[PDB]
Amino acid sequence: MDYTLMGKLNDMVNWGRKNSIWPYNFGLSCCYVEMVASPRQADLMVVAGTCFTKMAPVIQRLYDQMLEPKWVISMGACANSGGMYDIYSVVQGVDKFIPVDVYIPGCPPRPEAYMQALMLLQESIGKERRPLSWVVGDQGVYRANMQSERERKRGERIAVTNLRTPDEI
Amino acid sequence: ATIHVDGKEYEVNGADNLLEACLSLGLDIPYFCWHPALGSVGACRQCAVKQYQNAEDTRGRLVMSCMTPASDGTFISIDDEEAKQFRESVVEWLMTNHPHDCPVCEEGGNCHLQDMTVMTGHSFRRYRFTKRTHRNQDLGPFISHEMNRCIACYRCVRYYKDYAGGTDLGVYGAHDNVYFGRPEDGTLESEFSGNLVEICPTGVFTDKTHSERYNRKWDMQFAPSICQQCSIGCNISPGERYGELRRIENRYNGTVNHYFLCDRGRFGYGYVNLKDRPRQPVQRRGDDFITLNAEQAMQGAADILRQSKKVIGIGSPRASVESNFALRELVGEENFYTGIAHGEQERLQLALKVLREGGIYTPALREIESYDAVLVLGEDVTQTGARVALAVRQAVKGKAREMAAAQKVADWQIAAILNIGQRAKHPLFVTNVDDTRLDDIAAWTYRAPVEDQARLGFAIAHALDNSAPAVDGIEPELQSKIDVIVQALAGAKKPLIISGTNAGSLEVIQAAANVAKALKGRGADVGITMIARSVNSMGLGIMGGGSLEEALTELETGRADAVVVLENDLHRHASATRVNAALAKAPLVMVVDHQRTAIMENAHLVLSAASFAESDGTVINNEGRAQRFFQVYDPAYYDSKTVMLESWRWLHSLHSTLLSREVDWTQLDHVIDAVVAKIPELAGIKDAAPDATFRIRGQKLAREPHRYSGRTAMRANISVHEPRQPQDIDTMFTFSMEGNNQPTAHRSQVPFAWAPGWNSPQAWNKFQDEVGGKLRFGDPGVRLFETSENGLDYFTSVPARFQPQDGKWRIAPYYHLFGSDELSQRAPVFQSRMPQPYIKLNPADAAKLGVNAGTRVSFSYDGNTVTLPVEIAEGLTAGQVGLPMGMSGIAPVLAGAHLEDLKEA
Amino acid sequence: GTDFLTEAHLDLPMEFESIGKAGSRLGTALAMAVDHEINMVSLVRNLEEFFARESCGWCTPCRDGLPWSVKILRALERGEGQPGDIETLEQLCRFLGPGKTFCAHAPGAVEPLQSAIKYFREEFEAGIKQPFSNTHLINGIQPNLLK
Amino acid sequence: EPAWQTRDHLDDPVIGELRNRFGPDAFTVQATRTGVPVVWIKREQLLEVGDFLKKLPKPYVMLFDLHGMDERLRTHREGLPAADFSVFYHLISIDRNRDIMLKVALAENDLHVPTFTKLFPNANWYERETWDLFGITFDGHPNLRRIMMPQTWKGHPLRKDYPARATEFSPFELTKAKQDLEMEALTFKPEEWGMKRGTNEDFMFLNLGHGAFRIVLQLDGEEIVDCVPDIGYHHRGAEKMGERQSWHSYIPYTDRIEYLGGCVNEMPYVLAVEKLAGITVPDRVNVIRVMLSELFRINSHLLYISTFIAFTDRQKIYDLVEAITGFRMHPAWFRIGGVAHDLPRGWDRLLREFLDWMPKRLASYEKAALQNTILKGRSQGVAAYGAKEALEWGTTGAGLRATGIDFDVRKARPYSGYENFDFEIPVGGGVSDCYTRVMLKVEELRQSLRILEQCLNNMPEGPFKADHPLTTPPPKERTLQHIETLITHFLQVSWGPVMPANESFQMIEATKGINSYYLTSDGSTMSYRTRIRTPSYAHLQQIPAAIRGSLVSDLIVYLGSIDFVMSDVDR
Amino acid sequence: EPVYLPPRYRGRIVLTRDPDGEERCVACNLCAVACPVGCISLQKAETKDGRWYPEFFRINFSRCIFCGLCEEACPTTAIQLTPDFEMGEYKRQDLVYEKEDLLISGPGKYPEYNFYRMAGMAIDGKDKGEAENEAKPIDVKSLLP
Ligand code: SF4
Ligand code: SF4
Ligand code: SF4
Ligand code: SF4
Ligand code: SF4
Ligand code: SF4
Ligand code: SF4
Ligand code: FES
Ligand SMILES: [Ca+2]
């Protein structure tokens, strides 16, 4: 797969960053209350809620306080795009101002969708190349262009024929 | 008159019926078979109200409000329970046989039947039996036929036959198997058949051109615009979706084109959606074609234009007033040339002089319907100015209107009017080189060469007023028919003289001016109408400039080494060999245009101008009315690399880069101020529409309806990030629904008609002061000039009779509503409707040549031999040959020219 | 086009006003006798078929409401009537009266129906045998069970 | 004479009293469908009318609502004074069990009203929001600053000429706002927040962080001497969105206000729309709506009681709600004239399993909360107010009933057939502290379980949608089979249902107090005005008047004891 | 364990097919206008027999709130919300689902409804008069009165 801007131990580093992820769940709105450490210690920011203009600086500041390597998971339609609130007081998406690694649709998403997003982030972390040290080697981060989850899951989704009727519980 | 509706007192017009009087008051009565332009017939039985004898009456009686006069002291109830139950029952009876078709029906969301079903509150079906079904017909490329959806309201036949004068649509059958259509499959033959898609309250007659690329009404982006396909200036609402122009709706203008368009304006819009249009500036370097953005195109053009000694500019009657003015400012006043030929310019300037100096009032298109006798000289109105022909048909039916009014029959009781006035009609005298479509209602048709038509006009003017120059050599039978014309015109209270520049004869315009002056001197309330060729022919005539021949002379002599051609193909106004030679000699050609023309192969730079859909501007009517057209959509919203600016914007920024080496993308109001400051006879165009700072209680005017969908998905395949809403700095309209389109808003520019409960074209009732009247706060548009205090003198240049000289063939112009206009004949749906190119011959001339009907003859014009199949024309005269103007290879400038070497190929 | 009359109305003089006061009209004064072997539902069905197919198609109540009454009468003649059919016939009679339609064809059409429902209602009610249904079951959608 | 009929309420005794006091030409009575007498008052008599209503024999004691309205585009103003803007004041007399609405008309060039804060202290935040969203100045207001938008905001969003949709994002303004938040504590002027005596060398300023909101604290040592909370960080523009969606398509937005509520939030909106539409829903619709609202009320009460001190009960409730509606948190299931679908076959078993499992949990929660002595020492007596403070601050729900005032909307002003259910309204003593509120929430949980038991025992058979033509959408099987039903469905889901021009009002007992929708239709398919009164706004405004002289930990306990979420505050 | 979802669950949106195997969507655009967020876009196209179908059909799932108003507004039961929630993505552009990402190979939750069997518009396999509760077309030239 393509990558966008001595080998076994790099894989071990990716494995350690993959299996050790300390999240910082930002509350924001109802997505966090569906889902229900300091930003210095956290390496994952889970933004789940409406990005209001009055606390977009709060999100930006708490993201800047985090330390590399850092990853962002955006839960719900508000954090992905603004959702149903295309309105004067709402920022239309988290990725307007901070980069997002995984997106989850929903309003709110289920908690096991958050677990699925954690699995996807673990794969993305395990298949990436980052500098080993700040004095030796290339100081560039190579994100891998993963195959999209809708192209990967297309066959089993299109193969669906019948569903249970909505007259039952 | 005073009426009492539900205990509330209203003051109405007593000459109205109750339906139109109550709809004018804002009351909602359901109706199908009534139309404001068609009258009342009482078919659908939907408009029932309860009329009481007096104030102290409670029983009452159900009456049809469309058939009941709004007399003084009337007492009615709309919300009476019996009336509401009966109206719901009528809707239910219509619903019994209606197909389950709304998702796959083009009328959905725009359907009067849907609106009236919801308005009566009928939503529960208890009919359990079968539905009658019908076969459909093929009605041609424009109208799609779906007979299942018919509610038998008879609006189509009343419009098409009684109003429009068509003959091939009718009602067939009986009890509940009534069928509305043609006697057999075939194209509907009326030039105004396209108004059936708004006349029909259901989805029987639908816009087939729109149906190919269908979208719902709530998804359209609309703008108020002016039709660009002839000089009548009918108000239109073009609506677009996904970056392409989807539909042309009628925009109600009570002064011009009230409810109706012609088929050219309604269906010839398809050239806007052509894929060969220039979408980005292109500079030819060697054999390569480098694509530029706006900035470096302006810089390179300014550098090359600064290095040249003299720059000339060639305008067009297609372009707006602002575009031609911007070209005139860029090249200078003395270097600006109107893009039309010398004879065309002479006829156009004479028509302008007659209109604004002849002392005779020129009527608006709606006012044409109130004249008592019509003389049409040389102008094939139905093929060149079609809506004038429709208005002339109404003016002719005015005699039956007067006869019925003499028997105290109400104005709206149309069936009684047509029964009283059986075949009596106001006099119509048409003159042409052959038969016209107005001959069915014409009192007399004169088929003659344009010299003889002019001589007939001069003879009529002399017989009305002996001070006019006389005509020598009139035959006694022609003299008797002239006397019939003179008796009909002299007895008319409001005679109307219609002529125009399409005959290719200056003398026809002079004769029409003489007839109008002679009738003015007798005290008649005479009006005169001039039909020009193009959308802004009158504006280009007012602005003035040299002819195209002078510009080609400047290019060929080498006095001009740079030419800027604005929206002109130059082959319709001059010979193509001369134009190609002059443009090949010039070391710099810059073509500012929105259509891929044949002169762009010689062009060093092509500026991708916008069409009427993507531009704002002002165009001048054939009656001298300045009208704004507003931009429908931003072309760069979907394709980000599209650089398609207004022509005045291109030329103003080019002038600014020529002077101060900085681009200046100006504003429309600035250019309009420049026009009204420099050209004082175009000063009326400032008042055509309010400027860009106009607001309705602080908000702009919406281009799209409130329920516009796909706001976060229509561009999502390009990018999931929703782009910036395009900002309109030129006009008061916004490229969003965040704006006002209220029916009670104090404005005259209405992009589209929608009211809650009224989704169909019947929503225009809410936007009018009275139904069928004007718009509530005035119709848009302003007359540039008033009637002159003193008129002209008589034109003494009476031409001689036509003489067929051997070897020469006078070209008689034949115009086609589908084909003669340039941009509309570029539209793909016109190609099926376009007649095959036939060269028309007299039987005697074809017998002299030995030529039969259908064999191909070759003729040479300007040293160019072209071949056409022969059609025999009995109405044509000997020594004349008939040619279809504006088709492929036959320029309209050929009208009146002679022909050489006509022989069988 | 005239209303049916019973044995009690046989003693009335054949005048315009005397028969007008009885709930009918004199008409052409050519009377037709209906014996006990003729079913009134079939007779009115034949009458309404004539009146429905002799409509001119101009106006909505006759053109679209006479065929509905015809189909209801065919159902009642076959015994396939459903509840609300007699009420539908009565409101068709009430809404096809004078002034509701464009001409007098439809009031004359609904006069026999009105008179036969008024007098011989037992046959029209005997035509109704099936429960009312114009909607079938759609598999995944629970119906709105009105009362 | 249906419950949705347009009435003028001229037979209300308050109209006669105002007529005898001020004269017959001093006010204009408007006939509405609000169920409330609406009188237009001159601006120069507003304080006189308010003080007269404060002093009646059964006086109007609570300012329920105060907001503005842009009347410029309203084309149906028959029988109304000439107004470009207007301000309305909804006042409630609990003793009279009545309410009145006062409307003051304002011309566009003179947009100032006398302040109402001397008569009713909750008018402070209500007038601040009216200034923020409409630009209407209130003369005599102490700190008339913006409360929803930031202070450096241009324009007033609820005006008709303000664009609703989101503007283009600017990274420069984001960096500027982050810079301002960086130096906010450095340049904290204690006058742009209404404070005074800013820095006796002992007053310290603190900024802090059920939703996220910042409260500015003035401390003398450890004591709180003054505090102003900064709200608006969760402002979604739900009312502006009300003017941009159709009547049908706005229902999910009703859901997202008070996200613990769900169908409880849907209920007052659809009831007010049905008042506008002239719809009387059948009994099965009433029982379905009551049952879902009580399930969500139990869920919210369980979350409040647990977070005051848990998961399995809420999981069972969300499983039942997901079975019925298809979604846990935001069902969007109520409709104009009914509900989206019928009850699924098998809902009886799920509700019976939930009801046969809940009383043991009720006993567990009573043991965990009422008999906990450490909780009874921690929560008793901290931030307690009486009936007088509850009335003057618009406190509703558990706090108002904990002050001993027996005012529940389900019994005082019954809606959706709540009068057909046998249940009790628990009231407390004269003191509304944390422990009394928790006791009342537990007793309300028990009564909601009783209501659910009655919903299960006799569930009416019938339609889940009304027979009205304005029922949106129509029943789906008739839509798929019948053409007139298809036409109605087509126009209702696309252009929208046409509500005839009127004003309606519905107030309900939400999970945290009284929630109300005030809807103005101008005859169109969208709302001309959607005003949402939420209890959390009035409960947050009462906080500075109840912790004067307390500690910061007492403030934290008070925040935990007041049932509120910030989406309800800011909407 | 696998997560249980009720049959009414409002998860991933699909487009379904009629029992004859053709796609149910007639591109009537009712779902797009009924969407409160505006995240459905489609274009009507027509086959040679006259059958309406979506030329394209895209849903912005980064914008969708899974409220089910599109399914409620569909008059053909083409668009359906299904019990499936696993829809996470790496790029937000990959949350734009086109028609080949939505069109399943069966009827979904409504196994038998066919809109075209009810519509009076003629298509292939269904002439005039062949829809439900439809009589055969009587020609205007027929001999019967
Ligand atoms: S996506 Fe939905 S549930 Fe999540 S924060 Fe937004 S409105 Fe709340
Ligand atoms: S004509 Fe109107 S009512 Fe009939 S199918 Fe078309 S949209 Fe529906
Ligand atoms: S085809 Fe249309 S206009 Fe003609 S009668 Fe039928 S519904 Fe009326
Ligand atoms: S008459 Fe002329 S201006 Fe009017 S619609 Fe036809 S082409 Fe256009
Ligand atoms: S009542 Fe008369 S006008 Fe009307 S359709 Fe019948 S026969 Fe024709
Ligand atoms: S579920 Fe709701 S938000 Fe999603 S596409 Fe359908 S209508 Fe739009
Ligand atoms: S509502 Fe249904 S049939 Fe109509 S466009 Fe949407 S998915 Fe297709
Ligand atoms: S509109 Fe009056 S009967 Fe048709
Ligand atoms: Ca522009």
Token pair belonging to B691:
């400027």
Q: Within a domain: residue D320? A: yes
Are the CB atoms for A79 and E89 separated by under 8 Å? no
Domain with B874 in it: what CATH number?
2.40.40.20
Q: Quickly count: other Cβ atoms within 10 Å of residue D194's Cβ.
A: 14
Task: Indicate if D390 and D537 belong to the same structural domain.
Answer: yes
Task: Indicate if D501 and D387 belong to the same structural domain.
Answer: yes
Whole-number Å distance between alpha carbons of D568 and D556: 19
Sign of the CA dihedral with A149 first, then A151, A155, and A157 last: positive
Burial bucket for residue D203 (CB in 10 Å: 0-12, 13-18, 19+): middle
Token pair belonging to D366:
């009573």
Q: Within a domain: residue A149? A: yes
Find the residue in B nearest to C67 (Cα): B176
Token pair belonging to D25:
């030409």
Helix (H/G/I), strand (E/B), else coil: D382: coil
Per the CB < 8 Å rule, is E62 touching A109?
no
Are the CB atoms for B363 and B787 separated by under 8 Å? no
- Cα angle value D302/D306/D307 (rounded, 5°): 120
Minimum-distance ligand 7 atom for the alpha carbon of E74: 1
Residues with CB under 6 A from ligand 4: B 227, 229-230, 232-234, 257, 261-262, 264-265, 386-387
What does the DSSP assignment read for B4-28?
EETTEEEE--TTSBHHHHHHHTT--
Whole-number Å distance between alpha carbons of C90 and C69: 10
Per the CB < 8 Å rule, is E110 touching C140?
yes
Give the helix ranges, DSSP H, for C21-142: 40-53, 60-77, 85-94, 105-119, 121-126
| Residue ending a domain, choose from D139, D169, D203 | D139
Question: How close A40 gets to chain E, by Cα (Å)?
Answer: 25
Domain with A80 in it: what CATH number?
3.40.50.12280
Buried/exposed code over B485-502 (b: 16+ C-beta within 10 A; e: otherwise): bbebbeebebbbbbbbbb
Torsion, CA B374, CA B378, CA B381, CA B383, rounded to 10: 160
Whole-number Å distance between alpha carbons of B39 and B41: 7
What does the DSSP assignment read for chain E?
-PPP--TT----EEE-B-TTSSB------HHHHH-SS--EEEEEEE-TT--EEEEEEEEETTT-----HHHHH-SSS-EEE-S-----BSSGGGGEE-GGGTB-SS-BT-SS--STTT--S-BTTB-TT-STTBPPPPPTT-S--
Per the CB < 8 Å rule, is B103 touching E44?
no
What residues pair up with B496 in beta bridges, in sequence order?
A: B374, B527
Nearest residue by C-alpha to atom 4 in ligand 2: B149
Minimum-distance ligand 4 atom for the alpha carbon of B261: 5
Q: What value does the CA radius of gyration of chain D take, rounded to a whole number of Å? A: 24
Q: What are phi and psi of E83, to 5 degrees?
A: -70, 80
Kindly give, in sequence order, each residue whose CB lies less than 8 Å from that of residue C137, ignoring residues fewer than 6 positions away: C143, D477
Are the CB atoms for A63 and A98 separated by under 8 Å? yes
Token pair belonging to B358:
């002849």
CA separation (Å) from B886 to A82, B368, B383? 54, 28, 12
Residue B152 with chain C: CB contacts under 8 Å: 57, 60, 63
Q: Chains A, B: CB contacts under 8 A, how many?
A: 8
Nearest residue by C-alpha to atom 8 in ligand 3: B153
Domain enclosing residue D451, as ranges = 238-570
Are the CB atoms for A5 and A24 separated by under 8 Å? no
Q: Within a domain: residue D388? A: yes
Whole-number Å distance between alpha carbons of B228 and B826: 13
Whole-number Å distance between alpha carbons of B713 and E102: 15
Which position has the token pair 């056409």? B868
Q: What are phi and psi of D569, to 5 degrees?
A: -65, -50
Token pair belonging to B612:
């009427």
Which position has the token pair 């970056």? B243
CA separation (Å) from D262 to B670, D269, D515? 55, 12, 13
Give the start-end residues of each E strand in B228-382: 235-241, 244-250, 282-285, 288-291, 311-314, 336-337, 373-377
Find the residue in A nearest to C139 (Cα): A165
The count of domains in chain A is 1
Q: Within a domain: residue D531? A: yes
Mutate to test the interface with E, among C46, C53, C137, C139 (most CBs of E within 10 A): C139
Q: Quickly count: other Cβ atoms within 10 Å of residue B663's Cβ.
A: 17
What residues pair up with B570 in beta bridges, in sequence order?
A: none
Domain enclosing residue B829, as ranges = 808-904
DSSP label at residue B621: -
Domain enclosing residue A121, as ranges = 3-159
Crossing angle for the helix pair B81-95 and B112-119, nearest 10 degrees?
140
Per the CB < 8 Å rule, is D494 touching E33?
yes
Q: Chains B, C: CB contacts under 8 A, how many?
A: 81
Kindly give, in sequence order, each residue whose CB lies less than 8 Å from that of residue B458, ignoring residues fewer than 6 positions away: B468, B469, B470, B471, B510, B511, B514, B798
Single out the residue of B875, B872, B887, B871 nearest to residue B815, CA to CA.
Answer: B887
Are the CB atoms for C75 and C89 separated by under 8 Å? no
**Pick from D332, D476, D493: CB nearest E34:** D493
Whole-number Å distance between alpha carbons of D375 and D547: 20
CA separation (Å) from C30 to B539, C2, C26, C115? 77, 11, 9, 18
Are the CB atoms for D388 and D364 separated by under 8 Å? no
Find the residue in B nearest to C134 (Cα): B128
Are the CB atoms for D232 and D149 separated by under 8 Å? yes
Whole-number Å distance between alpha carbons of B230 and B232: 6
Strand E96-97: give its sheet, edge to edge. Answer: E40-46, E52-60, E96-97
Whole-number Å distance between alpha carbons of B621 and B638: 33
**Pick from B43, B89, B176: CB nearest C102:** B43
Minimum-distance ligand 6 atom for the alpha carbon of E69: 7
Q: Does B756 touch chain D (CB under 8 A)?
A: yes
Token pair belonging to C71:
């189909």
* CA D374 to centroid of chain Cα atoms: 34
**Pick from D248, D326, D489: CB nearest E8:** D326
Buried/exposed code over D382-401 (b: 16+ C-beta within 10 A; e: otherwise): bbbbebebbbbbbbbbbbbb
Kindly give, in sequence order, each residue whose CB lies less than 8 Å from that of residue B201, ignoring residues fewer than 6 positions away: B32, B111, B112, B113, B116, B151, B153, B155, B760, B762
Q: What are phi and psi of B613, to 5 degrees?
A: -70, -35
Which position has the token pair 């009610």? C125
Single out the residue of E56, E55, E51, E53 nearest to residue E28, CA to CA.
Answer: E53
Q: Quickly count: other Cβ atoms within 10 Å of residue B598's Cβ.
A: 12
Q: What value does the CA radius of gyration of chain B take, rounded to a whole number of Å? A: 28
Which ligand places an atom closest to the C-alpha of D332?
Answer: 6
The count of domains in chain D is 2
Mutate to test the interface with A, among E8, E65, E93 (most CBs of A within 10 A): E65
| Residue ending a domain, choose from D139, D162, D177 | D139
Which position has the token pair 């979420």? D565
Give the helix ranges, DSSP H, for B661-710: 668-678
| Residue ending a domain, choose from D139, D154, D171 | D139
**Pick from B136, B179, B712: CB nearest E39:** B712
Nearest residue by C-alpha to atom 1 in ligand 7: E74
Sign of the CA dihedral with B624 first, then B625, B626, and B629 last: negative
Strand B880-884 with B809-814, pairing: parallel
Whole-number Å distance between alpha carbons of E35 and E68: 9
Are the CB atoms for D355 and D456 separated by under 8 Å? yes
Kindly give, in sequence order, each residue whose CB lies less than 8 Å from that of residue D152, ignoring residues fewer than 6 positions away: none
Token pair belonging to B787:
């009637």
Single out the residue of B660, B704, B720 nearest to residue B221, CA to CA.
Answer: B704
Single out the residue of B142, B268, B227 nearest to residue B193, CA to CA.
Answer: B142
CA separation (Å) from B406 to B403, B410, B416? 5, 10, 12
Q: Quickly count: other Cβ atoms within 10 Å of residue D198's Cβ.
A: 13
Whole-number Å distance between alpha carbons of B787 and B526: 12
Per the CB < 8 Å rule, is B736 touching D165?
yes
CA separation (Å) from D570 to A75, C134, D125, D245, D247? 22, 50, 12, 19, 22
CA separation (Å) from B410 to B16, B37, B415, B659? 8, 15, 11, 67
Are the CB atoms for C81 and C130 separated by under 8 Å? yes
Q: Within a domain: residue A165? A: no
Token pair belonging to B374:
């019509």
Q: Quickly count: other Cβ atoms within 10 Å of residue D121's Cβ.
A: 17
Are the CB atoms for B87 and B99 separated by under 8 Å? no
Q: Quickly count: other Cβ atoms within 10 Å of residue A138's Cβ.
A: 11
Cα of B614 vs centre of ligand 9, distance in Å, is 7
Single out the residue of D463, D466, D465, D426 nearest to residue D442, CA to CA.
Answer: D426
Task: Indicate if D244 and D122 belong to the same structural domain.
Answer: no
Whole-number Å distance between alpha carbons of D182 and B262: 67
**Pick from A60, A90, A168: CB nearest D166:** A90
Which chains does chain B touch, 3 or more C-beta pairs < 8 A? Answer: A, C, D, E
Strand B589-593 with B336-337, pairing: unpaired
CA separation (Å) from B870 to B619, B820, B845, D61? 39, 19, 11, 97
Helix (H/G/I), strand (E/B), else coil: B240: strand
Mutate to test the interface with E, among C133, C138, C142, C144 (most CBs of E within 10 A): C138
Bond before B476 cis per omega within 30 degrees = no
Are the CB atoms for E44 and B215 separated by under 8 Å? yes
Q: Given in angstroms, what resolution was this structure solved at?
A: 3.0
Q: For a ligand 5 pocket test, name from C59, C66, C92 the mutation site with the most ligand atoms within 8 angstroms of its C-beta.
A: C59
Up-side HSE of residue A13: CA atoms within 13 Å toward CB? Answer: 12
Which ligand places an atom closest to the C-alpha of C62?
Answer: 5
Bond before D57 cis per omega within 30 degrees = no
Whole-number Å distance between alpha carbons of B21 and A168: 55
Give the start-end residues of each E strand in D416-526: 502-509, 514-521
Residue A55 with chain D: CB contacts under 8 Å: 212, 233
Token pair belonging to A168:
């039952």
Token pair belonging to B631:
């931009």
Find the residue in E nearest to D323 (Cα): E6
How far apart are the two ends of chain E, measured CA to CA in Å?
71
Sign of the CA dihedral with A127 first, then A128, A134, and A136 last: positive
Burial bucket for residue A19 (CB in 10 Å: 0-12, 13-18, 19+): exposed
Q: Within a domain: residue A140? A: yes
Task: Answer whether CATH 1.20.1440.230 is correct for domain C40-127.
Answer: yes
Single out the residue of D421, D397, D394, D393 nearest to residue D408, CA to CA.
Answer: D397
What does the DSSP assignment read for D216-239?
EEEEETTEEEEEEEE--TT---HH
Token pair belonging to D364:
């567990």
Whole-number Å distance between alpha carbons of D264 and D258: 9
